[PDB]
Design a protein around this ligand. Structure first.
Ligand code: I09
Length: 84
């Protein structure tokens, strides 16, 4: 319900994944990031909850080389450091 403003670099990732605006609900951000993950096939083939991103823009924005899609509190925290 409350809205968030992604910083410019996060925003650019979201638009590369189909976002067509600049303010979002957390849910919409998570959705486009999920699609971005799928589109770049950042997930591990065998351990599919794991995202490899040391060589991806997301890795630098999130400050991690790997993380799990199931780590929701951690994912919120990584996203929050990229919201205005
Ligand atoms: C599966 C897919 C497409 C990557 C989407 C994920 N799929 C959501 C997820 O938890 N998948 C694992 C479910 C597990 O197998 C138990 O059933 C994940 C998500 C959903 C809601 C809140 C958060 Cl914080 C994260 C996911 C979404 N949507 C996601 C979005 C962005 C990021 Cl950065 C990481 C995970």
């Amino acid at each position: 319900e409350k809205l968030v403003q992604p910083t410019p670099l996060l925003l650019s990732l979201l638009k590369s994944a189909g976002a067509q605006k600049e303010t979002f609900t957390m849910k919409e951000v998570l959705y486009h990031l999920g699609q971005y993950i799928m589109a770049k096939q950042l997930y591990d083939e065998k351990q599919q909850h794991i995202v490899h991103c040391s060589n991806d823009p997301l890795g630098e924005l999130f400050g991690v080389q790997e993380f799990s899609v199931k780590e929701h509190r951690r994912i919120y925290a990584m996203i929050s450091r990229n919201l205005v």
